[PDB]
Amino acid sequence: IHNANPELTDGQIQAMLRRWFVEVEGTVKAYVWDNNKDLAEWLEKQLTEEDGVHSVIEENIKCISRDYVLKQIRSLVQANPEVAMDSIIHMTQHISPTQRAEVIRI
Amino acid sequence: LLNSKDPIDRIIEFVPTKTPYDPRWMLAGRPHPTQKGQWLSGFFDYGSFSEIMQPWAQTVVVGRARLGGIPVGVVAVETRTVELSIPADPANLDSEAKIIQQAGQVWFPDSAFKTYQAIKDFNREGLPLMVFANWRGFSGGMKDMYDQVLKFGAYIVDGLRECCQPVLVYIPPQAELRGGSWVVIDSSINPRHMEMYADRESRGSVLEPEGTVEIKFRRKDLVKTMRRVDPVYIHLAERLGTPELSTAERKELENKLKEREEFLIPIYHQVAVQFADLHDTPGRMQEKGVISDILDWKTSRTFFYWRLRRLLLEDLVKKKIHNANPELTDGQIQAMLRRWFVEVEGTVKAYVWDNNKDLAEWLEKQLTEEDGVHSVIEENIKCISRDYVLKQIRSLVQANPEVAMDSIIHMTQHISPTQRAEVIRI
Amino acid sequence: PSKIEESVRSMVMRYGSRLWKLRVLQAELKINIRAIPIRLFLTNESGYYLDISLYKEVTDSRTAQIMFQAYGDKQGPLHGMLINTPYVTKDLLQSKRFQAQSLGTTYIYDIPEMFRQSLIKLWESMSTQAFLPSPPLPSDMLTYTELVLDDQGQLVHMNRLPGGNEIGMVAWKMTFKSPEYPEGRDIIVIGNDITYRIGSFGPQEDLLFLRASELARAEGIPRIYVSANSGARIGLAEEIRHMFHVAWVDPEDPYKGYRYLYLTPQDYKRVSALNSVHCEHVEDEGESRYKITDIIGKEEGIGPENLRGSGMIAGESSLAYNEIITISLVTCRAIGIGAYLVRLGQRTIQVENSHLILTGAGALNKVLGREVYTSNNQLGGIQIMHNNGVTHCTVCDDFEGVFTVLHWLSYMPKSVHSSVPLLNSKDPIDRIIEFVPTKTPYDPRWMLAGRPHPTQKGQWLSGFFDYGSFSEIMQPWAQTVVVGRARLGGIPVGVVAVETRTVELSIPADPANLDSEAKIIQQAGQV
Numbered sequence A: 001i002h003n004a005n006p007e008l009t010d011g012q013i014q015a016m017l018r019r020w021f022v023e024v025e026g027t028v029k030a031y032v033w034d035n036n037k038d039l040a041e042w043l044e045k046q047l048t049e050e051d052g053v054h055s056v057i058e059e060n061i062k063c064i065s066r067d068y069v070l071k072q073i074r075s076l077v078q079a080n081p082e083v084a085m086d087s088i089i090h091m092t093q094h095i096s097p098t099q100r101a102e103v104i105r106i
Numbered sequence B: 001l002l003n004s005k006d007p008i009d010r011i012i013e014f015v016p017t018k019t020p021y022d023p024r025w026m027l028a029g030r031p032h033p034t035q036k037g038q039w040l041s042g043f044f045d046y047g048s049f050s051e052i053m054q055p056w057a058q059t060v061v062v063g064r065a066r067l068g069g070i071p072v073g074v075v076a077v078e079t080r081t082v083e084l085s086i087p088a089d090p091a092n093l094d095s096e097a098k099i100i101q102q103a104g105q106v107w108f109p110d111s112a113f114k115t116y117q118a119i120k121d122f123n124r125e126g127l128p129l130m131v132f133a134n135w136r137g138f139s140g141g142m143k144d145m146y147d148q149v150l151k152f153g154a155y156i157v158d159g160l161r162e163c164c165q166p167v168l169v170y171i172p173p174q175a176e177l178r179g180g181s182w183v184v185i186d187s188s189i190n191p192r193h194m195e196m197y198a199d200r201e202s203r204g205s206v207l208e209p210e211g212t213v214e215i216k217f218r219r220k221d222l223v224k225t226m227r228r229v230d231p232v233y234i235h236l237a238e239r240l241g242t243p244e245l246s247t248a249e250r251k252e253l254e255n256k257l258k259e260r261e262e263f264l265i266p267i268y269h270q271v272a273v274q275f276a277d278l279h280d281t282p283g284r285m286q287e288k289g290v291i292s293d294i295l296d297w298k299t300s301r302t303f304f305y306w307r308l309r310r311l312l313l314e315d316l317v318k319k320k321i322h323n324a325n326p327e328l329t330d331g332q333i334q335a336m337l338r339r340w341f342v343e344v345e346g347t348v349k350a351y352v353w354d355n356n357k358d359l360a361e362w363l364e365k366q367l368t369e370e371d372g373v374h375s376v377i378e379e380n381i382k383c384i385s386r387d388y389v390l391k392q393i394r395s396l397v398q399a400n401p402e403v404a405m406d407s408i409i410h411m412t413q414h415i416s417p418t419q420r421a422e423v424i425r426i
Numbered sequence C: 001p002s003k004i005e006e007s008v009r010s011m012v013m014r015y016g017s018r019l020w021k022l023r024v025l026q027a028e029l030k031i032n033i034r035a036i037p038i039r040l041f042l043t044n045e046s047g048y049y050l051d052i053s054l055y056k057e058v059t060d061s062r063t064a065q066i067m068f069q070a071y072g073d074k075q076g077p078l079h080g081m082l083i084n085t086p087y088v089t090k091d092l093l094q095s096k097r098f099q100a101q102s103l104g105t106t107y108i109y110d111i112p113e114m115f116r117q118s119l120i121k122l123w124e125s126m127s128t129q130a131f132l133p134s135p136p137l138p139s140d141m142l143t144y145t146e147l148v149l150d151d152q153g154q155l156v157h158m159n160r161l162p163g164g165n166e167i168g169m170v171a172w173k174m175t176f177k178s179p180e181y182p183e184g185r186d187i188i189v190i191g192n193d194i195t196y197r198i199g200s201f202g203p204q205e206d207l208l209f210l211r212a213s214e215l216a217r218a219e220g221i222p223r224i225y226v227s228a229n230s231g232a233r234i235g236l237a238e239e240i241r242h243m244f245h246v247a248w249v250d251p252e253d254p255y256k257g258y259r260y261l262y263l264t265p266q267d268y269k270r271v272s273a274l275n276s277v278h279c280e281h282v283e284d285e286g287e288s289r290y291k292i293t294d295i296i297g298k299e300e301g302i303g304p305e306n307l308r309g310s311g312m313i314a315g316e317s318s319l320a321y322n323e324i325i326t327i328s329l330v331t332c333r334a335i336g337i338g339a340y341l342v343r344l345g346q347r348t349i350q351v352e353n354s355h356l357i358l359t360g361a362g363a364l365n366k367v368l369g370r371e372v373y374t375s376n377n378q379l380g381g382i383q384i385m386h387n388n389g390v391t392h393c394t395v396c397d398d399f400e401g402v403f404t405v406l407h408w409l410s411y412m413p414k415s416v417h418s419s420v421p422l423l424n425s426k427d428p429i430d431r432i433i434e435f436v437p438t439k440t441p442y443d444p445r446w447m448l449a450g451r452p453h454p455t456q457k458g459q460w461l462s463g464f465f466d467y468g469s470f471s472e473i474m475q476p477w478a479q480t481v482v483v484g485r486a487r488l489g490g491i492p493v494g495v496v497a498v499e500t501r502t503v504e505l506s507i508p509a510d511p512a513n514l515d516s517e518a519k520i521i522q523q524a525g526q527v
């Protein structure tokens, strides 16, 4: 999680894990948190198994990482507009023709 | 920095001698012993020296001072013998108080730990270090080895590796660095900040001359030397080389040779240690590149003032460069500064680099003046910063195309209509 | 024949210590079976491994010459060799191996083999602690490549024969399979060659150390340093030593001093082109003289460049400790810089009868003016280094040292980017602890590891941690606290615990201060 968004603090990270556990397992199973065995097993299943269950927690982490890099991009261009048109070309090269149509349209 | 009333361009009136002396006399100065008034000046600004932790580990002196109005941390070495008094615990009626003699120019566990504390504290305080290094090595006796001298010697290295301020080591006159005491303050530990300078009356090597002759120039080789020097020994040795003189004559010649060669040992021993001393000179260190320069004592104040001023200004501009592009290394940053100096001033003026005064003034003009000359160096730094953030943008989108179209909109909003026309055109 | 092999193996191993002391390295036994002759050939080098080969004499040749034929499995060096091959007169490795063993230390190029054999012991030792897979054959347990310097100063991975080092430093990258990591973990091994210009860090040795440490940091893997050295290299400019003349104050009475040392033109003209000496021309006593002011020396590796280099590598070690695992093994001795290089790793294994010093006993006696010290072990031996917290563990020989290194490595990650290794322990997690701490003083080890059941003769009372997993370090230093490593359910952990019994701290007397006394101080527990 921290590598996905290095600007998070500890409380935020722990909150994300707690919420994800409840959201995936359910609210009735929310009590299964202060149980080291059960929760360790669940975490192991999310961390060790690939190409299969696919580890939903990994998907949430990927969402965080995506949004973080997006925020960095926006932050750099907004803090420094003078470079906006030097990168605008390169990021419109490796795109689908429909995406280019949207760039041209808008 | 202060505008000091002690001139920078003066000389030092106190000269360190070969006999033991108080290290404070060279740091601060002393009352002129001849007269009643008249103060003999030291290295640092008059009245600026303040010692700390004075009675603890008295073989080393640490404190704060000012050089030309520039605050510095100070480390120096006691060359007099001191007496460490250890009290008796009243809870152990079988204990005794003890007095231990501690020689100067030696690192003991206490003095090594004190030096570590000073270094770490001044690194956090934010001051450069001026070290007057005169250690002949570490104590290797049983009791200092038991009391963990090796550990604290390691701590010194770990302290110096984390310096962020200039560290200037100077070997005073009639001072030496030997063996273990060099390898722990060598500039290779922190090459970006550490520098070493030596006086002309300095020495530095692995082993003192006595320790070298005891290994490489033992008695057998001393005799071989005498074979080609002493006229008396030569005459006797040549006479004994004549075939078949007589039994009695050969016996007499052999006894004369034995007496002569034995009689001449102490003098050729002094010669031998002199020879070995010629290997420990600062000329050799300068040729090999382990020191930066050889300085004179009387004018060291001026030199170190202008050098420290240069280094501090360079640190300012280097920090700006690093913030513009944190992915640069040290060689790159220094090269950028060197090239910019030449490019702006011209190639004929390129020699004006190993001149601390001139280059300090140039750097100050680039750093202190705004809305005016406008500081061309700032423009180059801004170029670096712009390109760096541009590279970050390109890197993020190219490493992750899936976000390219989520930011494409926002960066095409706060633009001129012609820029939008170019976006649509493409 | 296999039974004869077993018999001879046991008989040689039990008396291997005596054979070692008598320098018996080769042995041959001729015996007839039933009749077919067989010839047993035994090589017993360094005292951890005994090599036994077996050959039959086969006469099926074209000439009247007879040759050896082995049994296919491990044919060995004498396969197809004539039975009348004479005995040779030592080789590349010998006469350097012999010197190193004559100093009480192992030769450097025998270190890889030790690792292999130690690993075997490791796979055996841990078989009582965890459910391990079948161990691979010894030929697959360790593979290494030697790290050498090129002409530019960079590392080259090279496979060559042992004993081909041109400098006093050797290093390897080793990959090996351990019980905790049976897929391969990497280490970097660095060692001094005691026989090359006795000990003595030069610039090239320093450079190799630096580059190998850099490799370790770049890969994030452990660094193992084997210390057998004599500190920084020194020397004297011999090209001047036989040329100089003394300018005496009184050439007839040399006991009123001399003024300077000088070269004559005949000597100066032969060295001025080398930048070996700096002189200035003077006229004195009606003679043309070149007065010596500085000596540089034409030979590289003896001057102040060794100070820089030493400091350089010291800095490297200080960095390495904060990024990777650093372990140091002391096999012969370390002087000066060598000691610091050990200390900066902060994980020291010290072989019996070795010492870590900064100054030798002879030097101290020369300084102090009397025969204060007799041995260097009085200055840096176990009785000092192991009791003041420098040495973590002591071992009897080099082989046990290698084993201890591997043992420690079994608790920790294979790299700085890996997790802690977990084992499938044979000690159940779900049991209870059979030892209960009492109100009265007790040994902390009893609750950590357990104790023999005092009621019976068998029966171990279990403790907190996995049975047999506890390993204490720095035991005799500051005995009021116990520190070590252990495993909980196969999970390695660091352990801190407190002594509740009273202990006695014995402080020795310094022989250099005749007014000093040894002291015993009672240290209470829980303080």
Ligand SMILES: *C(=O)CCCC[C@@H]1SC[C@@H]2NC(=O)N[C@@H]21
Pocket (backbone or CB within 6 Å): B103, B106, B138, B139, B140, B141, B142, B143, B144, B145, C364, C367, C368, C510, C512
């Ligand atoms: C002085 O020339 C060097 C002093 C080195 C330390 C000496 S040697 C014996 C004493 N024991 C000890 O711990 N320090 C003293």
